[PDB]
RNA sequence: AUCAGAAGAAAAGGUGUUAGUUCAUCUAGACAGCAGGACGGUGGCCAUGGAAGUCGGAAUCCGCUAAGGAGUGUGUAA
RNA sequence: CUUGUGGCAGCCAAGCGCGACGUUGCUCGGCUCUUCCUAUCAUACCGAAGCAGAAUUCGGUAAGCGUUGGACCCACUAAUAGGGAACGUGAGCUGGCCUACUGAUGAAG
């Protein structure tokens, strides 16, 4: 039932007025998606479900030349009803796994700093067990036996690296959007630039 | 049906070998068993142990513990050992540990109807009588193993001398021109 | 020590380093342990396992669904023992649905035998008159000789 | 079901022979041999694939396939680059004295919670013990087989126990830190 | 050894009922006489036609039309147990219709300890389509690439002698 | 089957196994796995030293979506 | 055969008029002895429990070893466990021929 509703909403989104936006969600949290959608409806549901519901064949598809665009259409994208904000404004967000760390961030030994020295509250008692790093909670304060590098440049964001980055202030990410072409009602020219 | 036969007991089942042996003894055949340690019993090792600690618990009896004495007990239950027909059938059955010298030079036959591989589904739990009894009160597990290894050395050495000898007669067999007539008679 | 003395030691020194995964490990393998319990144990402690397993099973099913010449019988006042003699009965009112311990004013008739009725022997099904001022004849719905109490319904 | 196949991609190693239900696997690090008569299985070595096949097998025998596959993975990774087991020490009041003998094959621990026992552990062959100077109380357990290294870690853990006391008050002991390959 | 029996019969005609209807059954029985007994049992429990007012017009035996052609059989049956009613539907793959039922008697009395009188055969049908098959082992047996070593290796070649007590060599069995 | 097998307890329990029956999804990617999100009114209102979903008392509402339960536990005085 | 779960009356009540678990209702007798059982009093080893430690409680394996002196009591001790031998041992005990077992010789391959 939910999939059918998503397909129906996708058809309505395809029948929207203009601006032929292609963007639904990204690694950014729901708040960033809500903030982006505030200046406007972003909705994707299941990936490729809208393309499958529309149909690869041009006769089934409401748009024109959708057979080639179906393969191009992938990821969390959706219609909406701007260009400068998408091209320029890219809100920073904490990095996730699967990407490459822009640098080699390390954690100083001994007492740890929540802001990496930009302040370092020691009240995070459950964090000592939840960390799993070589840290000893002595005298009610977590003490690092040796320095641990969270990540390195050119290395994939590991699970431990991602977990440390979630608590730390590493916003090594920037939101991006895809507006290569526009499904104009009359022009019907969805460029692939 | 030779007067004296030797049954290798490695890999045979204690119950199904005994039933075959007990009948042959009553037929009058002098059956001698060798390598009684490597007999097998259906059921995991710890189970056959407990069924044996019941035997030791049963007391006034003489709980003979050596693997030969375990097999001899098995045969004594399939003979009419009260009567002089079975009392004279028990004394033909000589069950020994490993292979004493007067039998290691004799051909040892195996019972197809009671081998472990032909009678147990693959993967079934089983125990070895030699290992079991060595954990019940037997004290000669190690010595028979060392003695068996030594005989294996001599027996294997004996084969190599015989293997070359038969190879010479194998190489000289084709020299006979009667081989064509041998083929015509299928021999 | 004083007050919750083990609650600042945890506050100031830290937790047993390997307690949480041990308890997580225990909370996991207990599923296999529970089944192994029923397959090995025998006797009363195994019997105690049975109905207590079913108790939480049916209760779980409910929540997810919601998701010498002497008298050998008790008498009222052969030889009738004083201990066997009883004068108070926990007669339960039918319409009211309230069980109340009422004094045994008298026995109307004993269905067992007229001699028992004459002796005032309390037996199952016997009719006994009890005062209802604080709230009449009533029939004994139980056997006081075995239950140990005069259980009856109004 | 009548067939149940498992495939293994042979890493570098040197030899992965299955001669007579006995994997005498030789890798660049060294040679290790284990028995395989514990289960009745078809193990074929060909090319870069090792086929483990069950024919008309029960679920009891079917469960042995993945266990063997997990087993066979253990030493083949060990013989290639080795395995290292990192050990960490935690002491409450009495510091623990640790000594290494015959290049660490035997570990003796002393001064455990006031007790005066020279608890001696002859670690199983194929695993040796070393003390890391990079970080204090860090003990390195190097070997080519997880079940041997882990068992030694389990043994050193159980001999490092507390008796008739409260666990949540006493913290001294030895416990597993983490695993990993040598390289 | 069972046989296919097409059994056709009707009740005795009378002035009230001059033309009885010819009922037909395809039921299995080791002989002709058992086929009559099962017929009367099958029909009387259902249609309530009395034995003494019934005559049988023809007993025929149906040889398997294409015995050499491998087939998959669908067998609807009704188990009788302590409860006495179980809509069980088993499937067997073999060559002869009778042979499938034999195995069904073999399995029902082995897996479930059933009894010939208790079990009544409901309907036996051919399953010509692999899609119509519902059993994974039959589905796997119907695959294009069937291959397996001869199971129970000992059962092959067994011992191969008359009375081979005291074989002189170990058996390879491989 | 670590005391298998060759009507009395009897109602049921079993992550023991083999058959089945009735429902479910599933190349619109089934289950599991990891990878991430798992939001904002709002720390709803009483309740209290301290209760932010997670001591507790009635609902427990809403905007966003494919989805964030006035929250399922862990946890903290919070 | 017997062992550790009171009855009655209702509300529910998976289900098959009953209806399980829940819920309401107040209410002849004893000394010695021989063994044997574990349903363990202590001792051995474990688990859990606000277990600082000492000391304490429950539970698990455990019958190998013990489980008193004096008229319900009063002290030691680690404890002073429960039983059975169906008329415990009244043909060991009291009151209101042969076969066993222990020993001693013994002809004989």
PDB file of N, CA and C (backbone and C1' of nucleotides) in Angstrom, chain C residues 57-67, chain G residues 12-13 20-22:
ATOM      1  N   UNK C  57       4.201 -18.720  29.159  1.00  0.00           N
ATOM      2  CA  UNK C  57       3.847 -18.888  27.754  1.00  0.00           C
ATOM      3  C   UNK C  57       2.438 -18.379  27.477  1.00  0.00           C
ATOM      4  N   UNK C  58       1.466 -18.783  28.300  1.00  0.00           N
ATOM      5  CA  UNK C  58       0.096 -18.334  28.073  1.00  0.00           C
ATOM      6  C   UNK C  58      -0.034 -16.852  28.400  1.00  0.00           C
ATOM      7  N   UNK C  59       0.625 -16.400  29.471  1.00  0.00           N
ATOM      8  CA  UNK C  59       0.601 -14.977  29.794  1.00  0.00           C
ATOM      9  C   UNK C  59       1.202 -14.153  28.664  1.00  0.00           C
ATOM     10  N   UNK C  60       2.315 -14.617  28.087  1.00  0.00           N
ATOM     11  CA  UNK C  60       2.873 -13.949  26.915  1.00  0.00           C
ATOM     12  C   UNK C  60       1.866 -13.935  25.774  1.00  0.00           C
ATOM     13  N   UNK C  61       1.168 -15.054  25.566  1.00  0.00           N
ATOM     14  CA  UNK C  61       0.154 -15.116  24.519  1.00  0.00           C
ATOM     15  C   UNK C  61      -0.954 -14.098  24.757  1.00  0.00           C
ATOM     16  N   UNK C  62      -1.245 -13.783  26.021  1.00  0.00           N
ATOM     17  CA  UNK C  62      -2.298 -12.818  26.316  1.00  0.00           C
ATOM     18  C   UNK C  62      -1.867 -11.394  25.982  1.00  0.00           C
ATOM     19  N   UNK C  63      -0.644 -11.008  26.361  1.00  0.00           N
ATOM     20  CA  UNK C  63      -0.194  -9.643  26.096  1.00  0.00           C
ATOM     21  C   UNK C  63      -0.090  -9.372  24.600  1.00  0.00           C
ATOM     22  N   UNK C  64       0.479 -10.312  23.843  1.00  0.00           N
ATOM     23  CA  UNK C  64       0.590 -10.114  22.402  1.00  0.00           C
ATOM     24  C   UNK C  64      -0.793 -10.086  21.762  1.00  0.00           C
ATOM     25  N   UNK C  65      -1.737 -10.869  22.291  1.00  0.00           N
ATOM     26  CA  UNK C  65      -3.118 -10.775  21.832  1.00  0.00           C
ATOM     27  C   UNK C  65      -3.691  -9.393  22.113  1.00  0.00           C
ATOM     28  N   UNK C  66      -3.423  -8.853  23.304  1.00  0.00           N
ATOM     29  CA  UNK C  66      -3.848  -7.496  23.619  1.00  0.00           C
ATOM     30  C   UNK C  66      -3.072  -6.459  22.820  1.00  0.00           C
ATOM     31  N   UNK C  67      -1.884  -6.808  22.337  1.00  0.00           N
ATOM     32  CA  UNK C  67      -1.072  -5.903  21.535  1.00  0.00           C
ATOM     33  C   UNK C  67      -1.737  -5.683  20.181  1.00  0.00           C
TER      34      UNK C  67
ATOM     35  P     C G  12     -18.202 -12.684  31.722  1.00  0.00           P
ATOM     36  O5'   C G  12     -16.944 -13.546  31.263  1.00  0.00           O
ATOM     37  C5'   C G  12     -16.167 -13.166  30.137  1.00  0.00           C
ATOM     38  C4'   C G  12     -14.782 -12.740  30.548  1.00  0.00           C
ATOM     39  C3'   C G  12     -13.625 -13.405  29.820  1.00  0.00           C
ATOM     40  O3'   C G  12     -13.356 -12.838  28.548  1.00  0.00           O
ATOM     41  C1'   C G  12     -13.216 -13.454  32.141  1.00  0.00           C
ATOM     42  P     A G  13     -13.778 -13.625  27.196  1.00  0.00           P
ATOM     43  O5'   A G  13     -12.415 -14.276  26.683  1.00  0.00           O
ATOM     44  C5'   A G  13     -11.268 -14.436  27.538  1.00  0.00           C
ATOM     45  C4'   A G  13     -11.048 -15.895  27.866  1.00  0.00           C
ATOM     46  C3'   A G  13     -11.739 -16.903  26.950  1.00  0.00           C
ATOM     47  O3'   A G  13     -10.932 -17.211  25.812  1.00  0.00           O
ATOM     48  C1'   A G  13     -11.967 -17.525  29.255  1.00  0.00           C
ATOM     49  P     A G  20     -11.288 -23.191  33.090  1.00  0.00           P
ATOM     50  O5'   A G  20     -10.048 -23.961  33.721  1.00  0.00           O
ATOM     51  C5'   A G  20      -9.632 -25.210  33.195  1.00  0.00           C
ATOM     52  C4'   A G  20      -8.314 -25.086  32.476  1.00  0.00           C
ATOM     53  C3'   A G  20      -7.395 -23.980  32.961  1.00  0.00           C
ATOM     54  O3'   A G  20      -6.707 -24.312  34.153  1.00  0.00           O
ATOM     55  C1'   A G  20      -7.465 -23.970  30.601  1.00  0.00           C
ATOM     56  P     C G  21      -6.847 -23.372  35.449  1.00  0.00           P
ATOM     57  O5'   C G  21      -5.692 -22.293  35.262  1.00  0.00           O
ATOM     58  C5'   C G  21      -4.366 -22.697  34.962  1.00  0.00           C
ATOM     59  C4'   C G  21      -3.602 -21.600  34.267  1.00  0.00           C
ATOM     60  C3'   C G  21      -3.585 -20.256  34.972  1.00  0.00           C
ATOM     61  O3'   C G  21      -2.630 -20.192  36.016  1.00  0.00           O
ATOM     62  C1'   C G  21      -4.077 -19.940  32.684  1.00  0.00           C
ATOM     63  P     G G  22      -2.821 -19.138  37.213  1.00  0.00           P
ATOM     64  O5'   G G  22      -2.671 -17.722  36.502  1.00  0.00           O
ATOM     65  C5'   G G  22      -3.096 -16.537  37.153  1.00  0.00           C
ATOM     66  C4'   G G  22      -3.735 -15.571  36.189  1.00  0.00           C
ATOM     67  C3'   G G  22      -4.672 -14.552  36.815  1.00  0.00           C
ATOM     68  O3'   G G  22      -3.985 -13.450  37.380  1.00  0.00           O
ATOM     69  C1'   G G  22      -5.719 -15.525  34.938  1.00  0.00           C
TER      70        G G  22
END
